[PDB]
Amino acid sequence: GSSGSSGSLQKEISTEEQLRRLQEEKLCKICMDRNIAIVFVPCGHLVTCKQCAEAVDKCPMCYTVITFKQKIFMS
Ligand SMILES: [Zn+2]
Ligand SMILES: [Zn+2]
């Protein structure tokens, strides 16, 4: 003889997964390791992070020479 039957209908996502969805959608796209905190000039494309942005001499998407490393403050 035993008892105990419970079951509530609910569900939610934690910051871990959630963020992993957006955080991994805006951040760098080349290495996808760090967060995008730099743009390109003239074409402003923050599709790269401090590392990449610097590594790539010219926009890896617009092949437009980067003669300026502007830093944004999205956060
Ligand atoms: Zn990167
Ligand atoms: Zn560009």
In the chain, where the domains are located: 1-75
1-75: CATH topology: Herpes Virus-1 (3.30.40)
d(CA 63, CA 67): 12
**Cα(5) to centroid(ligand 2), Å:** 59
Ligand 2 mean position, distance from CA 40 (Å) = 6
CB 40 within 8 A of CB 27: no
Distance CA 21, CA 5 (A): 35
Chain breaks in the chain (C to N over 2.5 A) after: none
The first and second tokens of residue 39, run together, are: 């743009």
Around Cβ 72, how many Cβ atoms within 10 Å?
11
Number of Cβ within 10 Å of residue 63's Cβ equals 10
Angstrom distances, CA of residue 14 to CA of 10, 18, 22: 13, 6, 13
User: Are 66 and 45 spatial neighbours (Cβ–Cβ below 8 Å)?
Assistant: no
Which experiment gave this structure? NMR
Q: Six-digit token pair at 5?
A: 């039957």
